Every structure is written in structure tokens, then in C-alpha cells.
Design an enzyme around this catalytic site. Structure first.
Site, PDB file in Angstrom:
ATOM      1  N   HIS A 293       0.869  -1.461   0.398  1.00  0.00           N
ATOM      2  CA  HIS A 293       0.328  -0.218  -0.266  1.00  0.00           C
ATOM      3  C   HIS A 293       0.945   1.561  -0.015  1.00  0.00           C
ATOM      4  O   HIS A 293       0.143   2.191   0.089  1.00  0.00           O
ATOM      5  CB  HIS A 293      -0.941  -0.074   0.962  1.00  0.00           C
ATOM      6  CG  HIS A 293      -1.196  -0.961   1.545  1.00  0.00           C
ATOM      7  ND1 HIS A 293      -3.233  -1.358   0.082  1.00  0.00           N
ATOM      8  CD2 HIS A 293      -1.806  -2.344   2.472  1.00  0.00           C
ATOM      9  CE1 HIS A 293      -3.653  -2.642   0.793  1.00  0.00           C
ATOM     10  NE2 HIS A 293      -2.768  -3.403   1.665  1.00  0.00           N
TER      11      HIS A 293
ATOM     12  N   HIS B 147      -2.462  -3.439   8.298  1.00  0.00           N
ATOM     13  CA  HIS B 147      -3.901  -3.699   7.238  1.00  0.00           C
ATOM     14  C   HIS B 147      -4.400  -2.443   6.929  1.00  0.00           C
ATOM     15  O   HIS B 147      -3.853  -1.418   7.403  1.00  0.00           O
ATOM     16  CB  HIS B 147      -4.883  -4.751   7.758  1.00  0.00           C
ATOM     17  CG  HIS B 147      -4.275  -5.966   7.973  1.00  0.00           C
ATOM     18  ND1 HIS B 147      -3.514  -7.309   7.084  1.00  0.00           N
ATOM     19  CD2 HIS B 147      -3.510  -6.529   9.482  1.00  0.00           C
ATOM     20  CE1 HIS B 147      -3.216  -8.240   7.526  1.00  0.00           C
ATOM     21  NE2 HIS B 147      -3.049  -7.959   9.251  1.00  0.00           N
TER      22      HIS B 147
HETATM   23  N1  LIG Z   1      -5.927 -10.724   9.170  1.00  0.00           N
HETATM   24  C1  LIG Z   1      -6.113  -9.663   9.282  1.00  0.00           C
HETATM   25  N2  LIG Z   1      -6.343  -9.575  10.381  1.00  0.00           N
HETATM   26  C2  LIG Z   1      -7.290  -7.998   9.991  1.00  0.00           C
HETATM   27  N3  LIG Z   1      -6.886  -7.228   8.864  1.00  0.00           N
HETATM   28  C3  LIG Z   1      -6.733  -8.226   7.935  1.00  0.00           C
HETATM   29  C4  LIG Z   1      -6.259  -9.410   7.931  1.00  0.00           C
HETATM   30  N4  LIG Z   1      -5.849  -9.640   6.562  1.00  0.00           N
HETATM   31  C5  LIG Z   1      -6.083  -9.467   5.820  1.00  0.00           C
HETATM   32  N5  LIG Z   1      -7.159  -8.044   6.617  1.00  0.00           N
HETATM   33  C6  LIG Z   1      -7.749  -7.264   5.656  1.00  0.00           C
HETATM   34  O1  LIG Z   1      -9.391  -7.256   5.319  1.00  0.00           O
HETATM   35  C7  LIG Z   1      -9.699  -7.201   3.909  1.00  0.00           C
HETATM   36  C8  LIG Z   1      -9.235  -8.121   2.924  1.00  0.00           C
HETATM   37  O2  LIG Z   1      -8.124  -8.458   3.442  1.00  0.00           O
HETATM   38  P1  LIG Z   1      -7.607  -9.967   1.776  1.00  0.00           P
HETATM   39  O3  LIG Z   1      -8.331  -9.969   0.702  1.00  0.00           O
HETATM   40  O4  LIG Z   1      -6.085 -10.473   2.544  1.00  0.00           O
HETATM   41  O5  LIG Z   1      -8.201 -11.502   2.504  1.00  0.00           O
HETATM   42  C9  LIG Z   1      -7.843  -6.236   3.555  1.00  0.00           C
HETATM   43  O6  LIG Z   1      -8.646  -4.955   4.138  1.00  0.00           O
HETATM   44  C10 LIG Z   1      -6.837  -6.074   4.387  1.00  0.00           C
HETATM   45  O7  LIG Z   1      -5.914  -5.148   4.554  1.00  0.00           O
HETATM   46  P2  LIG Z   1      -4.108  -5.660   3.882  1.00  0.00           P
HETATM   47  O8  LIG Z   1      -4.240  -6.316   2.272  1.00  0.00           O
HETATM   48  O9  LIG Z   1      -4.075  -4.349   3.355  1.00  0.00           O
HETATM   49  O10 LIG Z   1      -3.718  -6.778   4.569  1.00  0.00           O
END
Ligand SMILES: Nc1ncnc2c1ncn2[C@@H]1O[C@H](COP(=O)(O)O)[C@@H](O)[C@H]1OP(=O)(O)O
Length: 135
Positions: A16, A130
Site C-alpha cells: 500500500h 492492514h
Molecule cells: N488478519 C487480518 N486482520 C485484519 N485485517 C486483515 C487481515 N488480513 C487481511 N486484512 C484486511 O482485510 C481486507 C481483506 O483482506 P484479504 O483480501 O487479504 O482477505 C483488506 O483490507 C486486508 O488488508 P491488507 O490487504 O492491507 O492486508
């Protein structure tokens, strides 16, 4: 999911903040080559890592993307960003994926946590891990 060589903050930065090219197709090759799959959607904030770290210092708020988490923070100010959308999925040859780029000015909500004790630099005790949302 992130490659093992990165801490959550280093991955947050790779996903990001460090848009290696102003073009989404090229910028996404970095994330995709690391993740071993073509990410369908990804936002690059046109801001600095230090700026986001400071947003982590804003009041805690519930993460709209994970309602059970309270480690999110609102930018309080809009920033320029580029949102990449996969236009050419290529599950067999990811270097072949193409993306569109959509420029916008919005707020961002980041989940922040204490740094990875062993691998994150001591300079930043608290780091973004995240990108929960752009509103
Ligand atoms: N373990 C986690 N805890 C909280 N938010 C998460 C986590 N893993 C991914 N996310 C965030 O949730 C959304 C969906 O994630 P994903 O597409 O990987 O399943 C994105 O905003 C992602 O941010 P980020 O992409 O910065 O990790």
C-alpha cells in the site's frame, strides 16, 4: 497472505505504500510475484510510511472490514491514492495479469499494531499492518 520474509508492516508497505510504478499493471507484478497469484483489487496510498505511522496515533476505532477488531485508525484527512483492479486474470501465468488504475482522493482507515520485535526496526514501535478501508 504474505511471503515469510516480510513482517506485517513490511508487507503493508509493499502492498500500500511503495507503488513501484505509477502504472497498476507494473506495480501489481511486485505484489503478485510475491503472493503467487493475481490480487483482484489493491489500493496504493500516495503518502509516506511515516505519515501512516502517525495516523496509527489517531484515536482507535472499529475496523469496518473486521468488526471484531479495535486496532484501526482513521486518516482524518483525504490523501491521493490509486486503486488497481484486475482486468486480465491469469491463474496459470501471473506475469500476464493486467490491471486498470483509478485515481481518487479519499480517507483511509488502517489497522495498526506493535512492531515485529525481531524483524521490524525499533524506530517505529507502532506500525500499520492492514489497509482496512478507503472511505
Ligand atoms: N488478519 C487480518 N486482520 C485484519 N485485517 C486483515 C487481515 N488480513 C487481511 N486484512 C484486511 O482485510 C481486507 C481483506 O483482506 P484479504 O483480501 O487479504 O482477505 C483488506 O483490507 C486486508 O488488508 P491488507 O490487504 O492491507 O492486508
Amino acid at each position: 497472505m504474505k511471503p515469510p520474509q516480510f513482517t506485517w508492516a513490511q508487507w503493508f508497505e509493499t502492498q500500500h505504500i511503495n507503488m513501484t510504478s505509477q502504472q497498476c499493471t507494473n506495480a501489481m507484478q511486485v505484489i503478485n510475484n510475491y503472493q503467487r497469484r493475481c490480487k483482484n483489487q489493491n489500493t496504493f496510498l500516495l503518502t509516506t510510511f511515516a505519515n501512516v505511522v502517525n495516523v496509527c496515533g489517531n484515536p482507535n476505532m472499529t475496523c469496518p472490514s473486521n468488526k471484531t477488531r479495535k486496532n484501526c485508525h482513521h486518516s482524518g484527512s483525504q490523501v491521493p491514492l490509486i486503486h488497481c483492479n484486475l482486468t486480465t486474470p491469469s491463474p496459470q501465468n501471473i506475469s500476464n495479469c493486467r490491471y486498470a488504475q483509478t485515481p481518487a482522493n479519499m480517507f483511509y482507515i488502517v489497522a495498526c499494531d506493535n512492531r515485529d520485535q525481531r524483524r521490524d526496526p525499533p524506530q517505529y514501535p507502532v506500525v500499520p499492518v492492514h489497509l482496512d478501508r478507503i472511505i
